Design a protein around this ligand. Structure first.
Ligand code: MG
Ligand code: MG
Ligand code: MG
Ligand code: MG
Lengths: 256, 256, 256, 256
């Protein structure tokens, strides 16, 4: 609609500002370590976005990674650069994410990977799209004919590989949370699992996976929402096959 | 120039055929099981290349992943699709690799990712390029300022992540060996490790990294060649420690 | 729509076939002269399009430029390559046109420019799009504030350009009818004028420009359909001024 | 090489600045009427180009279209946006142009069309390229085998269209002098004529077409250089005829 179209055009415009600096940001800043960085372009991109929303959606709230952490029954969740590390090194797997949550419910989601010219989006009840055409998660039902994905985490990643590497065609670690969730919605991957992520990393990828007929849940298999800590995105075919392996790894390291 | 230009235009032309089928080939074979496939496109793309190769290079040999394994002083190493699994699922990280090896010497290489519109190539003494512009290897001289990569291998993988997660910013698993290697030459990645690999998977990558001022060696740390089993590519500023870690990852599982 | 989504996916896929021979076609045949040519690719592309339509819509008629001139209630109009001259020479302004005419009126229409990655489409009562985002006709209400365009015609073009130049910013001759009409819908040009044209050249553009909010009439101002001979696509704001000048041109050349 | 690479990367970088505002330029200032305008984006982009050149070649001269007119042995000719009108309306045919003129003679030219992803360029003595690929002018030896092109001139155009349309397949009016000239070098067009012009309009085009094996002369047939106001670019196989028509058109209006 108005909101969806606005979001698509906004992220597509800002995407170009990011291209100016892609792989060329000399000022890398650490937030809570060397694996968790931010740059001046993350902020500039966020300002560009936040300002347009604040302009057309005057009395609505914003929750943006870099700083703005408001609350509201009408909240826009923004990730100026999902995959800042990639962005800095020059890898194409980074994106801009914009979800519009109403009453804690994701009503719209859009992910835009600039260097790839891929714009995945979904509005509630309208289905998922990719640059205008319909997308639906894969039909794959056998883990052996599946390609799953994960993000670079503590001891989780390396272990989740060990467990999965056997019953799976191949595992991917691309670099963009939002983009990886959206890829399942587009049928490119079979499932995506995250750990200790904020809502700006998954709010958009959540409605896009479900509107594309997939499944989005926490590690307990109980349907997840924008405010869940663990995330499992899947085509809804080999979901449980994954729910298990994940907890198998979680227990081994420490959990419950 | 002659063979360089030839090679770029050719792979670029072939990339488009791949695009017609990319993500839409549900007729998969297994060259050795699920973890290793081939498609008619693999075959159909390789054909379109080999044909052209002879049309202008009669008295020369050819080596393609699936089908031709000739040998000679004027050889061409072809890989119709590097990342067939990706190509099959709809992932952008797949490429076409081609190297001209004269007297056992890689005289030039070219990697082309059609979905990403990336063409990385290099000629002996001419330096490396990326779509016409020069590319050098990264300057990040410390593991805490690096992003590494490797392919999905038996135990080496999940055990390489664990053994290097706290070492580097991130470890990526993209899918295409030729592309991944070309990326360290591009400085998008600081190092890439490949275990148990064929010549057509690194032939081009090899000369691209070295021409881009990087390092390519076996695990023994000795200068690597088109014919080696395990490779390591880097900016030559963090090779030592990587060799070290690589040489200490096979330990935990085995492989003498 | 599954019909529109069907249309977008089919032309996008076929666009890669075209990309293989774009600028690399050696055998150009004259249909009625050196200014009206055709190639084998036009046919190959068309065949790819027709077989898919006939497979998923077995009882609907087809009217494709190169040969298939059926007629009916459920009709598919096709121009395998709008701008074969451009396509042959290597210019990017060439496209694949597809419209669905029902009981005389165009229900949907998509235009795909492969080299340009531009897919403009519209389904009746749903608005016009450009790669997933909504587009609308321009807002230039003054001719001196406009950019117009036409095709390449015998007498018409020259007189036109003369009788318009001193009254508009500039007139453009890009080379693809469908693409040009669709651009009026995208708002990139303010009006497009075609003379002694064919239905497959304007069916898709007709609905896109109408859905985009503009106007499409014949040279007399009378609204038009896929079957009129002459056309005028505009933003609706400058139309009269255009129809006037056009006839001043039909007047000098001749008519009756 | 030092200068060429620097030029290619700078333009591609500035290219994205342009993409942010492409088709969304609010305030258009008039230079010499609605026929010739400039926008703050032209200035904003020019400043970004000038900025880098001052930094790496501080002791060199600059001649930029929008306000900088220096003179010297080492000189850089610049056009922030060639095809501003196109840029404004949202047409993809616009580009950045940069030439380095050492000792009165241009030895390097770069033309980048951001919206098209086309970087054509040429360093004196090394030949013409297009995104790394090598290019050479066309081989069409007869006008009926060609596709010519012109700029939008108040009297020239219409006449040229008239005395040239029955003689050739089609005459194109694209909207970007630098790109149009680079196109003859790319062989996408057989000839291009420009009436009334400045060094920043065709300095880069000049060298590219020459390194591509074609010819650039003033209307009189006499060779042409960065400093002339009549230009005719061609594949050098139909040049004579074009100069013919060009002159004839001049007689239909006025001159000497
Ligand atoms: Mg972020
Ligand atoms: Mg292969
Ligand atoms: Mg046609
Ligand atoms: Mg300009």
């Amino acid at each position: 609609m108005d909101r969806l179209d606005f979001s698509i055009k906004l992220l597509r415009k800002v995407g170009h500002l990011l291209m100016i600096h892609w792989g060329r940001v000399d000022n890398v800043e650490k937030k809570t370590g060397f694996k968790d960085i931010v740059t001046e372009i993350d902020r500039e991109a966020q300002r560009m976005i936040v300002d347009e929303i604040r302009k057309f959606f005057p009395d609505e709230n914003i929750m943006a990674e870099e700083g703005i952490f408001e609350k509201g029954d009408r909240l826009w969740i923004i990730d100026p650069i999902d995959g800042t590390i990639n962005f800095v090194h020059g890898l194409p797997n980074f994106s801009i994410s914009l979800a519009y949550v109403e009453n804690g419910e994701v009503k719209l989601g859009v992910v835009h990977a600039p260097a790839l010219n891929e714009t995945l989006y979904a509005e509630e009840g309208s289905g998922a799209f990719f640059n205008g055409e319909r997308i639906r998660v894969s039909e794959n039902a056998s883990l052996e004919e599946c390609v799953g994905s994960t993000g670079s985490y503590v001891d989780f990643t390396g272990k989740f590989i060990e467990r999965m590497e056997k019953r799976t065609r191949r595992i991917r670690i691309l670099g963009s949370a939002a983009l990886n969730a959206a890829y399942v919605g587009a049928g490119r991957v079979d499932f995506f699992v995250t750990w200790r992520i904020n809502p700006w990393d998954i709010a958009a990828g959540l409605i896009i996976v479900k509107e594309a007929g997939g499944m989005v849940t926490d590690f307990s298999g109980k349907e997840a929402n924008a405010f869940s800590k663990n995330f499992i995105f899947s085509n809804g075919l080999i979901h449980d096959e994954v729910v298990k392996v994940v907890n198998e790894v979680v227990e081994e390291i420490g959990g419950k």
